């Protein structure tokens, strides 16, 4: 028992505001404080504030004093955090968290998956998925490497996978880089020259921020 | 804000070795109730922090015995008696006896292994991208060690730094190696005007640059 479900990825515009949730279960939602923490891509962790659902009493740090608003609907064991007047600094991942250490036979310390917020004025863009195959029959030996290029998409995340996730050994999914408001992703899979193209290899790309869902097949090909 | 200072910030270690992280706080962490709420977390890239030890020396459910905790007042130590390949990530000590609850900057534990030369692959632009007028030439340099490396693209001989996207992966939780993909983009037109395309990278595993190239429109 005891887990925290946080709402999904949110794309927000500067100056706007976002409301995100955290649903709890496994412990008495109205008897402990619930925390919220921020973590920037590079940076460490910083505590925003907490809330005691029992009597709706809150607590904040001077920094987020006017940046965050906390609430909670106890009839649904759900808590909320609202960030106002967004900027580039507000862009980060947020976690709700519960800790408790005074009862030995019930130690609590859990974190939601976290909610990644992206503050941008950029517009959603479906990704272009391109298959990466070696030209002709030449080979490095016994193993061959195939690839999948996924570029020009925003915002993220993207969910790359091979043969519906049935092929996971020998795979390298590189972090997305950003080229002026656009993300490029690439992934490579390495298999024995016997399996491919005798056995299908397919790249499965999904971009929920634009409901795009591609299944590119790595076919063999000729010179350029 | 009672400050937490961890040291060192980066921790190079070899499998089997022992490791140590020091955590210090600007003020005492002994709560009036009598307990000392100092904890240690581990965060794998892409996940939320996971508790290892609470109240300075208590191992949380499911945490290996290889991990121990000591400390008093302001001085605290986390110890990894034996470093496996799972221990990859950043360790954070944390305080919760004062408000606000604070975390240290963290210590990234890096593994040292036997050097390994990269496996390089070159990929000409697909035709699907060609139709759009663009042409991305990709190069994969998988499973190498150490992490230091530098890729180089030479079109018809000369180097080309303009228009390259490099991306790296965290130290592998299996190989303890690294990988990277270098992507050189051009315009169909520019790609059309040359024949030789090279991806060469110099790495410790050799005194001569690992080369990989292809001639356009040729097997």
């Amino acid at each position: 028992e005891v887990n925290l479900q946080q709402s999904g990825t949110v794309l927000a515009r500067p100056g706007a505001s976002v409301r995100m949730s955290c649903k709890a279960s496994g412990y008495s939602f109205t008897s402990y404080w619930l925390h919220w923490i921020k973590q920037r891509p590079g940076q460490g962790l910083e505590w925003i504030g907490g809330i005691y659902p029992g009597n709706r009493d809150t607590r904040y740090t001077q920094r987020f004093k006017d940046k965050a608003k906390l609430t909670a609907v106890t009839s649904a064991n759900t808590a909320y955090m609202e960030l106002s007047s967004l900027t580039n600094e507000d862009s980060a991942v947020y976690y709700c968290s519960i800790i408790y250490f005074d009862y030995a036979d019930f130690i609590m310390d859990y974190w939601g998956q976290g909610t990644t917020v992206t503050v941008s004025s950029a517009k959603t863009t479906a990704p272009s998925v391109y298959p990466l195959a070696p030209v002709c029959g030449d080979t490095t030996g016994s193993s061959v490497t195939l690839g999948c290029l996924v570029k020009g998409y925003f915002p993220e995340p993207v969910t790359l996978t091979w043969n519906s996730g049935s092929l996971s050994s020998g795979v390298h999914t590189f972090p997305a880089v950003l080229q002026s408001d656009l993300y490029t992703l690439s992934s490579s899979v390495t298999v024995t020259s016997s399996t491919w193209p005798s056995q299908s290899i397919t790249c499965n790309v999904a971009h929920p921020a634009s409901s795009t869902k591609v299944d590119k097949k790595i076919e063999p090909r000729g010179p350029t | 804000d009672i400050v937490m200072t961890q040291t060192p910030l980066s921790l190079p270690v070899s499998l089997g070795d022992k490791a140590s992280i020091s955590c210090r706080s600007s003020q005492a962490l002994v709560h009036s109730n009598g307990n000392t709420y100092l904890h240690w977390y581990l965060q794998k890239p892409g996940q939320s922090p996971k508790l290892l030890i609470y109240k300075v020396s208590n191992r949380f459910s499911g945490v290996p015995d290889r991990f121990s905790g000591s400390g008093s007042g302001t001085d605290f130590t986390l110890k990894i008696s034996r470093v496996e390949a799972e221990d990859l990530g950043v360790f954070f000590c944390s305080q919760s006896t004062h408000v606000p609850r604070t975390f240290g900057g963290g210590t990234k534990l890096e593994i040292k292994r036997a050097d390994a030369a990269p496996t390089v692959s070159i990929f000409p632009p697909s035709s699907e991208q060609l139709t759009s007028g663009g042409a991305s030439v990709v190069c994969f340099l998988n499973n190498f060690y150490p992490k230091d490396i530098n890729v180089k693209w030479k079109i018809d001989g000369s180097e080309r730094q303009n228009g390259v996207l490099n991306s790296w992966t965290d130290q592998d939780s299996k190989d303890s190696t690294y990988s990277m993909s270098s992507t050189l983009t051009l315009t169909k037109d520019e790609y059309e005007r040359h024949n030789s395309y090279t991806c060469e990278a110099t790495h410790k595993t050799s005194t001569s640059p690992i080369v990989k190239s292809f001639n356009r429109n040729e097997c």
């Binding site: 404080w33 | 709420y37 919760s96």
Partner: peptide
């Protein structure tokens, strides 16, 4: 009871 960190105080 308990602190903002849920400790008995």
């Amino acid at each position: 009871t308990k602190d903002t960190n849920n400790n008995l105080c």
